Ligand binder design. Structure first.
Ligand SMILES: COc1ccc(NC(=O)c2cccc3c(N)nc(C)nc23)cn1
Length: 841
């Protein structure tokens, strides 16, 4: 058609990348994937309930926590129903199904129950105690306001209609024609055959003089038969001089199972100054500058098609299965897992170590490994272990079938859990040898089945497309596939949103250039222009899709006194049913890598989710944060909060003479009573401990005073995680004298609140250790995909020591309290030191 020719231009401006383009491709893999994705896309669209998909109920099957049960009067929950302007407060049992609440309105005295101010509906067949919003009200002690109205039209979601390799004993060989850098030592090419970070063979070239062009025309005969080549095997080409400068990759087996034959000119990636970018099958799009390599792949079509056990052996094997994800496997260890593979198969915990013990560079081994994969009764049966599942999806596993068993294990996750691991499952796509994968398709099904998962999948993919050339092509193909099945309704939200954000990033960047009262002029001025026939009436808040932002409260908007000039924007809620008049506060900033903040913030939600399994509430504040392009993005403004340094500058003022008594005063000054004050002390002890533990585990505990905030209600929380991770005497974390003074203690004393503090830190700390493997994998994955240059290895290893791996709960609990002591002993040294650094250099 033509309407479908104008449509591709819409998607391209939505994706932020032109997919259809073929200027930076050397094969039809991406086109092949775009085609391949059409089936799971249309398959999912066809299978989704149009009503339940339109109202996207935000449910959960996890048992309502203890803290929220101890927060109920008597199996009675009050809901406030609203219509015209007329209210009503009804009684509801925690098992009161939503639809049956209308037979408690047409019997107690057609339509659906929406929420006041939010695009959240209380539809579907679930007990009310199971709606996120309900659990959110109960947690923070609030009234449940519903605005009974007409269900959205499912018609609005409507989608726009549409020779065997095993026969050559021939040793693999590659011809290095040469390299050529269009601009400038000695130089040598390094050709590696890899599979799951495991190096099968290595070759080189004679060191030639580093000139603007270098030729060899040499054949590099590897010590690997053509038939011993596994799918997902990479030819890795690196240029040294001794330091590496470029590298580029080529899959020695394509998407069609054919051995790669032909002439290749690969525009190579440069090094700066391990991470995910080094694994890409994508070539550099920039040719005017990029180093190039020319190679030849012989072009003669070659396609790719139980007894007993001793006692000390079982014990050595058990000692292997037990060991954490980062403990390396010796040659002796691997040879053991392999020989006793059938016994190793009975333990799902053995799968990452057992599959790492596989000699992938050998045809016969892979075969026995697939024979091993067919007898998967135990794995397929056992309860889902995300931590174990995440391990098979990392950089260590290039095998299609191994990776697929992990994806099938994810298939059982409810939407609630996909949203917890979404960001990291999307980052895990970088570990996929191919563009089309079970994981790529899994993210597609999940995004298309649920609007919340789909809204977030959009921004996550969009973020990557804009700031990563190594993966934008692949990610762009997944986003396009998502957009062709989400519906024209959401396809409209995504458009309003992109329009709004791009207008605001322009304002961010421009104001950043004019660097004063003069700045306060332009900002407000530009915020008037965009507020005309350019910016639409409203838009969904990208970090809170249930919120619609209206007009810009121009009077409240401003530039912040930072090295960079982030906008402090404020919007009216664009929804009349809104039970309040409070604005929507967003910070727009360029200069810090917001992807790192997203990662940590997401790990924080997981730690909050871990603590829920043990009825604990450490009151964390993982505020909304969406990366939108390079250095640029937005941040949720936490309401009624100040930095700990500002509370100090308030009654000491830019000095460093940190008063141990200030904070506790500030709280009383803010407290409407002496009671809400105790709740503010109650919330403090919790939030403080929560961040104390979580910050320590992640190794971001030693923070700046300016980089820590508190709410006028006791809620403490760290910020700028992309500050330390983005460039970083010492301390575990931050348990300053002003904090301890709020906990009734002084110097080397004790009080009931502080004893409580330590008892919360012990419960919390140990509660995370029951999830060691999970946290290790997430931390490990995060550093490989989000903290570039900050990989080394000794960086990953940090988390092992923090979680005190191998230690008993008793060795651990002691370690933490002593970690707390480093604070009591340091007092203000650290803070005063950061002051001596962070404000005076
Ligand atoms: C490194 O990325 C960043 C950058 C800034 C921030 N936050 C702030 O600068 C910042 C400043 C003032 C108020 C707030 C606030 N109320 N809430 C939040 C999250 N951040 C704030 C968090 N992460």
């Amino acid at each position: 058609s033509e309407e479908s020719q104008a449509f591709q231009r819409q998607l391209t401006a939505l994706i932020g990348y032109d997919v259809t383009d073929v200027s930076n491709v050397h094969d039809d893999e991406l086109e092949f994937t775009r085609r391949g994705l059409v089936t799971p896309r249309m398959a999912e669209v066809a299978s989704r309930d149009p009503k339940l998909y339109a109202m996207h109920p935000w449910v959960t099957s996890k048992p309502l926590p203890e803290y929220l049960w101890k927060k109920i009067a008597n199996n009675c929950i009050f809901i406030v129903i609203h219509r015209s302007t007329t209210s009503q407060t009804i009684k509801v049992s925690p098992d009161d199904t939503p639809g049956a609440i209308l037979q408690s309105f047409f019997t107690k005295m057609d339509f659906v129950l929406r929420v006041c101010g939010r695009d959240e509906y209380l539809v579907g067949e679930t007990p009310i105690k199971n709606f996120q919003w309900v659990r959110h009200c109960l947690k923070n002690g609030e009234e449940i306001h519903v605005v009974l109205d007409t269900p959205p039209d499912p018609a609005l979601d409507e989608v726009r209609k549409e020779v065997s390799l095993w026969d050559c004993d021939r040793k693999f060989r590659v011809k290095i024609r040469g390299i050529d850098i269009p601009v400038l030592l000695t130089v040598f090419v390094e050709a590696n055959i890899q599979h799951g970070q495991q190096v099968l063979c290595q070759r080189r070239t004679s060191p030639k003089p580093f000139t603007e062009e270098v030729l060899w025309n040499v054949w590099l005969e590897f010590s690997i038969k053509i038939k011993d080549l596994p799918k997902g095997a990479l030819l890795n080409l690196q240029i040294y001089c001794v330091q590496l400068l470029y590298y580029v990759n080529l899959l020695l087996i394509d998407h069609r199972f054919l051995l790669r034959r032909g002439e290749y000119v690969l525009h190579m990636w440069q090094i700066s100054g391990f991470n995910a970018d080094k694994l890409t099958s994508a070539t550099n799009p920039d040719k005017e500058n990029s180093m190039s390599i020319s190679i030849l792949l012989d072009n003669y079509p070659i396609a790719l098609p139980r007894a007993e056990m001793p006692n000390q052996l079982r014990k050595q094997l058990e000692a292997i299965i037990a060991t954490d994800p980062l403990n390396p496997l010796t040659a002796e260890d691997k040879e053991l897992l392999w020989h006793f593979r059938y016994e190793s198969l009975k333990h799902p915990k053995a799968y990452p170590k057992l599959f790492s013990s596989v000699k992938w560079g050998q045809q016969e081994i892979v075969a026995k490994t697939y024979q091993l994969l067919a007898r998967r009764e135990v794995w397929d049966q056992s309860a889902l272990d995300v931590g174990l599942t995440m391990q098979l999806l990392d950089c260590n596993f290039s095998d299609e079938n191994v990776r697929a068993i992990a994806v099938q294990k994810l298939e059982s996750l409810e939407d609630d859990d996909v949203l917890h691991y979404l960001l990291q499952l999307v980052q895990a796509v970088k570990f996929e040898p191919y563009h089309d994968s079970a994981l790529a398709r899994f993210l597609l099904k999940r995004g298309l089945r649920n609007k919340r998962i789909g809204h977030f999948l959009f921004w996550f993919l969009r973020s990557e497309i804009a700031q990563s050339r190594h993966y934008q092509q692949r990610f762009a193909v997944i986003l396009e596939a998502y957009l062709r099945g989400c519906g024209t309704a959401m396809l409209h939200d995504f458009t309003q949103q992109v329009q709004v954000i791009e207008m605001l990033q322009k304002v961010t960047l421009d104001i950043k250039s004019l660097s004063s009262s003069q700045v306060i002029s332009q900002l407000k001025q530009k915020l008037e222009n965009l507020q005309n026939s350019q910016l639409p009436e409203s838009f969904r808040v990208p970090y809170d899709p249930g919120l619609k932002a209206g007009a810009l409260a121009i009077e409240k908007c401003k530039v912040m006194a930072s090295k960079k000039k982030p906008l402090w924007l404020e919007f009216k809620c664009a929804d009349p049913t809104a039970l309040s008049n409070e604005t929507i506060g967003i910070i727009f900033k360029h200069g810090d890598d917001l992807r790192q903040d997203m990662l940590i913030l997401q790990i924080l939600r997981i730690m909050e989710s871990i603590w829920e399994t043990e009825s604990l509430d450490l009151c964390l504040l993982p505020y909304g944060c969406i990366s939108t392009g390079d250095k640029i993005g937005m941040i949720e403004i936490v309401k009624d909060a100040t930095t700990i340094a500002k509370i100090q500058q308030s009654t000491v003022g830019n000095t460093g003479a940190f008063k141990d008594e200030v904070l506790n005063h500030w709280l009383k000054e803010k407290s409407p009573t002496e009671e809400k004050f105790q709740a503010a002390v109650e919330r403090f002890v919790y939030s403080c401990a929560g961040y104390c533990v979580a910050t320590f585990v992640l190794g971001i505990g030693d923070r700046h005073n300016d980089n820590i905030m508190i709410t006028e209600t006791g809620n403490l929380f760290h910020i700028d995680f992309g500050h330390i991770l983005g460039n970083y005497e010492r301390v575990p974390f931050v348990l300053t004298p002003d904090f301890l003074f709020v906990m009734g203690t002084s110097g080397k004393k004790t009080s009931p609140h502080f004893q409580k503090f330590q008892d919360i830190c012990v419960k919390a700390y140990l509660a995370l250790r029951h999830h060691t493997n999970l946290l290790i994998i997430l931390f490990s994955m995060m550093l490989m995909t989000g903290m570039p240059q900050l990989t080394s290895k000794e960086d990953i290893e940090y988390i092992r020591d923090a979680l005190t791996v191998g230690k008993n709960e008793e060795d651990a609990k002691k370690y933490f309290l002593d970690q707390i002591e480093v604070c009591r002993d340091k007092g203000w040294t650290v803070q005063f030191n950061w002051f001596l650094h962070l404000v005076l250099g």
